[PDB]
């Protein structure tokens, strides 16, 4: 069989740690990675000539990617082209073979509707603009390129078509992870502690939600107290039924910074329908890689929760 | 055996509906009522001569009440005097007999320390001053006595010694119910919807707490959502471990107005250690008396929860 997983976000294709957590979960033996900048129509020269970004529905051969994607189901080794990233040009293609798990990730994994009918499980990954700025400050600060504070003006110039081109895809994804500045902590820089939330969608079977103590009644839980000595500022979870874009969703939400072990196992003991064959398996998957960015906050929690639901969908698809 | 229950509050002795809910729970066959204005030393004439309220530790024969209270344990029929309430004077006493359950309620049920060593289970009942004003407006409005708005100046004159005389008793009670103005609803009169909270104390065995989904981690739950269509404004529960007066307590807290049936059974299905032999027994005890004041809000919930814990203590004391 062929299963398929759609990831959506502008974190750079193969440049986000969610794929790394999926690699720790499945293994690169069982899955292969497909970037989606490879199906660009023409180059950055023709982007400058046509005056167009890399976000245009003109800018990709959306039909040949569909033909290779449908041929992925039939077992044959696909021949996919490669965007030469340094030059902006296009490599003559590479013949790669299908695997047990196939992923699809790029700026438009979901813009096509026939592949939206093809993708077995979908993830959009949203980022608020504040932590965009806080990540670009780290981007041009660690490199010391000295290109800051007009990239601020690049943000809002990149903004308007992006909301037209990309953001209506989240109206069709299953799970969407938003990352916000933390309301809890104020006297830091604006990107230390994240306020993350995984708006997951009901409906489509196999995918359960992961509900905190009750399906469908908003519950804001702080695990500090008689059995956990919370540091500053500690965790503040949330939950809530909601209808996002007129669709039955269930936001599960975490604010805070995981400082130690027991506060991360105590949270995991109380989530429900998390689909583990193993007690504390989510905590083990958190602490197999202490060095990954975002393990100390809820981003690494939610990414591995989504990947664990991907295990659930894979077990549903392969019996 | 002889069991004993201490109730503390200035709601008038035998003039609060918590005793009525206890009557619906136990029965006046199994319990008897003892007012504690009867042990006054001298009359309102001598209150005017001595310049003293009915709240003085001078103003009661605290030793003869202790002698009758200790003789209550030994089975003999006590001979208690009676405060003639209309005249302020004192009746020659009445010979009443002990029962299965004995209650004690007044302004000082707990000021003595030997009877504090005697009382098997204790309840203080606190009232905020705002709903004091909102109840006295109903007091002088329904009667149409036309004595309002200088009773406002009677409040703060009654205040200062009351905080000296009475309020340090709550540092030794088990369960204390505070009643507050509702933060949830604003465009009403100030006494419609109550924000009630039952600060209950750990420690002393037999008395469990009643915890909402977790012992000892603050959790603010709103039961609106997929299975309950909430009216305005709906319910907003709470919970939290705390240390009140340096004592390990666990506040359970309700804000809102119960408008119908399913929102009152759905809350009761999720409380824990409520000590019922019967499913939904708390909802039945709510709706055996729809006419009682405060059944539509959390006051009637918390009073019957405390009375149900009194059933638990009675079953612990009688095996």
């Amino acid at each position: 069989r062929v299963v398929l997983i759609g990831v959506a976000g502008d974190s750079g294709c193969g440049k986000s740690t969610f794929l790394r957590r999926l690699a720790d979960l499945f293994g690169e033996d069982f899955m292969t990675v497909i970037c989606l900048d490879d199906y660009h129509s023409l180059d950055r020269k023709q982007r400058k000539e046509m005056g167009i970004t890399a976000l245009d529905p003109r800018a990709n051969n959306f039909d040949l990617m569909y033909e290779q994607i449908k041929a992925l189901k039939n077992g044959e080794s696909i021949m996919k082209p490669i965007y030469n990233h340094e030059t902006g040009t296009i490599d003559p293609p590479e013949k790669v073979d299908p695997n047990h798990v196939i992923v699809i990730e790029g700026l438009h994994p979901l813009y096509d509707e026939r592949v939206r009918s093809l993708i077995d499980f979908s993830v959009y990954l949203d980022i608020s603009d504040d932590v965009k700025i806080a990540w670009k400050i780290k981007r041009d600060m660690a490199e010391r390129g000295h290109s800051y504070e007009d990239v601020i003006a690049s943000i809002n110039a990149r903004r308007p078509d992006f909301m037209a081109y990309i953001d209506p895809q989240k109206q069709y994804a299953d799970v969407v992870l938003q990352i916000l500045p933390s309301q809890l902590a104020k006297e830091e820089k604006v990107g230390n502690i994240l306020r993350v939330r995984m708006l997951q969608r009901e409906g489509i079977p196999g995918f359960e939600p992961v509900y905190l103590f009750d399906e469908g009644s908003t519950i804001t839980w702080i695990p500090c107290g008689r059995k956990l000595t919370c540091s500053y500022p500690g965790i503040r979870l949330s939950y809530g039924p909601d209808e996002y874009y007129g669709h039955p969703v269930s936001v599960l939400e975490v604010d805070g910074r995981f400082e130690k072990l027991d506060e991360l196992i105590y949270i995991e003991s109380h989530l429900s329908n998390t689909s583990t064959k193993h007690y504390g398996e989510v905590t083990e998957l958190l602490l197999k890689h202490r060095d990954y960015p975002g393990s100390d906050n809820g981003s690494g929690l939610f990414q591995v929760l989504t990947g664990l639901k991907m295990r659930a969908t894979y077990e549903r698809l392969t019996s | 055996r002889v069991v004993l229950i201490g109730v503390a509050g200035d709601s008038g002795c035998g003039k609060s509906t918590f005793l009525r809910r206890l009557a619906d729970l136990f029965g006046e066959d199994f319990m008897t009522v003892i007012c504690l204005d009867d042990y006054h030393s001298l009359d309102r004439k001598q209150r005017k001569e001595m310049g003293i309220t009915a709240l003085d530790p001078r103003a009661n024969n605290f030793d003869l009440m202790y002698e009758q209270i200790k003789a209550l344990k030994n089975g003999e029929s006590i001979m208690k005097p009676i405060y003639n309430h209309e005249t302020g004077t004192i009746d020659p006493p009445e010979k009443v007999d002990p029962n299965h359950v004995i209650v004690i309620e007044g302004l000082h049920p707990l000021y003595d320390e030997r009877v504090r060593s005697l009382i098997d289970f204790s309840v203080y009942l606190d009232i905020s001053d705002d709903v004091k004003i909102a109840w006295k407006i109903k007091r002088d409005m329904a009667e149409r006595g036309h004595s309002y708005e200088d009773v406002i100046a009677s409040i703060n004159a009654r205040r200062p010694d009351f905080m000296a005389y009475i309020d340090p008793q709550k540092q030794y009670a088990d369960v204390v119910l505070q009643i507050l103005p509702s933060q949830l609803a604003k465009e009403e009169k100030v006494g419609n919807i109550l924000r009630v909270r039952m600060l209950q104390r750990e420690g002393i065995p037999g008395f469990e707490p009643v915890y909402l989904f977790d012992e000892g981690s603050t959790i603010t739950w709103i039961p609106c959502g997929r299975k309950l269509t909430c009216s305005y404004p709906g319910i907003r529960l709470s919970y939290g471990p705390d240390e009140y007066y340096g004592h390990p307590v666990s506040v359970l807290e309700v804000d809102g107005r119960f408008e119908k049936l399913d929102e009152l059974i759905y809350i009761e299905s999720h409380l824990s250690n409520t000590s019922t032999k019967h499913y939904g027994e708390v909802t039945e005890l709510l709706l055996k008396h729809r006419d009682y004041p405060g059944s539509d809000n959390g006051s009637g919930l918390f009073q019957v929860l405390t009375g149900l814990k009194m059933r638990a203590t009675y079953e612990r004391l009688t095996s």
């Binding site: - | 049936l261 059974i265 019967h278 499913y279 939904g280 039945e284």
Partner: protein, 337 residues
């Protein structure tokens, strides 16, 4: 317009005729034939002067020895005990309403089909696998080629909507019932000889008990509860109306107020016109002539241990049952094939 007939002009027949006289304008049914063991002079009098529903008032009743004029509307009438000598094809009869209490078998009721009738609706729990249908539970799921259909007994016709509501809302493991039933015509008045001994005794004097399988007919009309419902009946000296006690063992626990809430909203959404809900302290004779097939008595509903519920339901076994017969007849007229 469907030409219909009535076999046996007894209590159910007179009530059926009176109901159709009160629901004439909205009817695809025209009553054109009756037959009783009496002459046409007597049963017109018995139609006009019912000692239970009073004197009929809306239309004029008269007769001569061959026809009966009800309100100007003529209806034919004959007398024969053999169903095989009956003018059905001579009268053009689609649906005959078996109400004699005699022809409960398939082979008995099919004599009308042989003699020239197209469909037969029998108002009794029939022997053998006759397809049974209750209005309000499964009056949709009949195949229109089933020409021999059966309405169940009045007790089943009352009890089954309540059991449907409680099975959908809570789920039922087991269930008893004990209907306190009004005395019917089968009992002998004084102590006379009779096939069953407990019906042989006096009706006006006695609580006579009887065993019925009409509780099991709920297991026919609701298939997943068959072999789980059983109960007895008590015939007491009241002439018209009756009440049914029902003890179910649900598995989803609840309280007494919640089942009343469930049945109250089911009275207003789905079972409207079938189940009425009454929070009054009424008594039996305030249900003579009520249109619903079950009035749930609210003040007596009780739950012990969470998983054991008791309801009681007033129902008129002479008027509401006739209403459900006529509703089933119109509903099979609306899906004539």
């Amino acid at each position: 317009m469907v030409r219909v007939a009535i076999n046996g002009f007894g209590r159910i027949g007179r009530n059926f005729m009176r109901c159709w006289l009160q629901r004439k304008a909205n009817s695809k049914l025209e009553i054109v034939g009756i037959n009783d063991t009496s002459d046409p002079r007597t049963n017109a009098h018995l139609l006009k002067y019912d000692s239970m529903l009073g004197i009929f008032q809306d239309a004029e009743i008269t007769a001569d020895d061959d026809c009966i004029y009800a309100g100007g509307h003529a209806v034919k009438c004959v007398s024969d005990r053999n169903p095989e000598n009956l003018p059905w094809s001579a009268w053009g009869i689609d649906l005959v309403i078996e109400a004699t209490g005699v022809f409960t078998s398939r082979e008995g009721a099919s004599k009308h089909l042989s003699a020239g009738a197209k469909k037969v609706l029998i108002t009794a729990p029939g022997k053998g696998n006759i397809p049974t249908y209750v209005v309000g539970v499964n009056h949709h799921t009949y195949d229109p080629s089933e020409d021999i259909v059966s309405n169940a007994s009045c007790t089943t016709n009352c009890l089954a909507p309540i059991v449907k509501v409680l099975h959908e809302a809570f789920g039922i493991q087991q269930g008893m019932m004990t209907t306190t039933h009004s005395y019917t015509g089968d009992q002998r008045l004084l102590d006379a000889s009779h096939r069953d001994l407990r019906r042989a005794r006096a009706a006006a004097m006695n609580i006579v008990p009887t065993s019925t399988g009409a509780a099991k007919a709920v297991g026919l009309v609701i298939p997943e509860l068959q072999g789980k419902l059983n109960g007895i009946a008590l015939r007491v000296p009241t002439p018209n109306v009756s009440v049914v006690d029902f003890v179910a063992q649900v598995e989803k626990p609840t309280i007494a107020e919640q089942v009343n809430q469930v049945i109250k909203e089911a009275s207003e959404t789905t079972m409207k016109g079938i189940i009425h809900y009454s929070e009054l302290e009424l008594v039996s004779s305030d249900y003579r002539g009520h249109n619903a097939s079950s009035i749930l008595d609210a003040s007596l509903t009780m739950v012990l241990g969470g998983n054991l519920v008791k309801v009681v339901a007033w129902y008129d076994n002479e008027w509401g049952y006739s209403q459900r017969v006529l509703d089933l007849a119109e509903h099979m007229a609306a899906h004539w094939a």
